[PDB]
C-alpha cells in the first residue's frame, strides 16, 4: 500500500514536471518500475519492515537443518514485546489448541516466540458485507 502510494507520487511528480513544461507525457516512462520491485525485495531480504522505527526480524532465513525444523519455522509466531515483562511470557489458558504449550525457545526469547498447534488455522479474513445484508434483512 505504501509503496504503491510512492509509485503514484512519483508518477504525479513526473507528469506534473512535463505538463507545466507544456507538453503531453508518455505514461510508460513515468512509471518507475524500480520502486515496487526493489522495495518488496529489500523488505523480504533484510527483514526491516518498512522504507529503506520499524519492526525487525519479520523475515528470516528458513531453517534447513531438518524437515521438522523447516516445518516448525514455517509455523512460528512472534510477539513484539521487547527482550522484563514476565506476564506476556507466561502460557496463557487461551493457548489451548491454538499454540503448542511445549515449543518455545529457552533464553531471552522464552514465551515470546511460539508455534501453532498441529490443527491451528488462521483465518485469511472475508468481507463483512453479506453478514450485514443478512442482518439488515433479518429482524
Amino acid at each position: 500500500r505504501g509503496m504503491f502510494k510512492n509509485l503514484l507520487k512519483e508518477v504525479r511528480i513526473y507528469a506534473q514536471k512535463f505538463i507545466d513544461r507544456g507538453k503531453d507525457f508518455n505514461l510508460e516512462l513515468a512509471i518507475k518500475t524500480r520502486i515496487i520491485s526493489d522495495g518488496l525485495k529489500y523488505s523480504l531480504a533484510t527483514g526491516n519492515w518498512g522504507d529503506q522505527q520499524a519492526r525487525a526480524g519479520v523475515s528470516q532465513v528458513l531453517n534447513r537443518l531438518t524437515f521438522a525444523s523447516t516445518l516448525s519455522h514455517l509455523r512460528r509466531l512472534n510477539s513484539p514485546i521487547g527482550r522484563k515483562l514476565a506476564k506476556p511470557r507466561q502460557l496463557h489458558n487461551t493457548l489451548w489448541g491454538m499454540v503448542c504449550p511445549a515449543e518455545t525457545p529457552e533464553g531471552h526469547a522464552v514465551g515470546l516466540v511460539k508455534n501453532l498447534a498441529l490443527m491451528a488455522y488462521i483465518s485469511v479474513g472475508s468481507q463483512p458485507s453479506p453478514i450485514l445484508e443478512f442482518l439488515e434483512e433479518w429482524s
Binding site: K41, L44, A45, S59, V61, R76, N78
Partner: peptide, 13 residues
C-alpha cells in the same frame, strides 16, 4: 530472495 529462502513469521498484534 537473492537465492535465500526467506520465511515471514506471523507477527502478533
Amino acid at each position: 530472495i537473492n537465492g535465500s529462502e526467506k520465511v515471514l513469521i506471523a507477527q502478533e498484534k
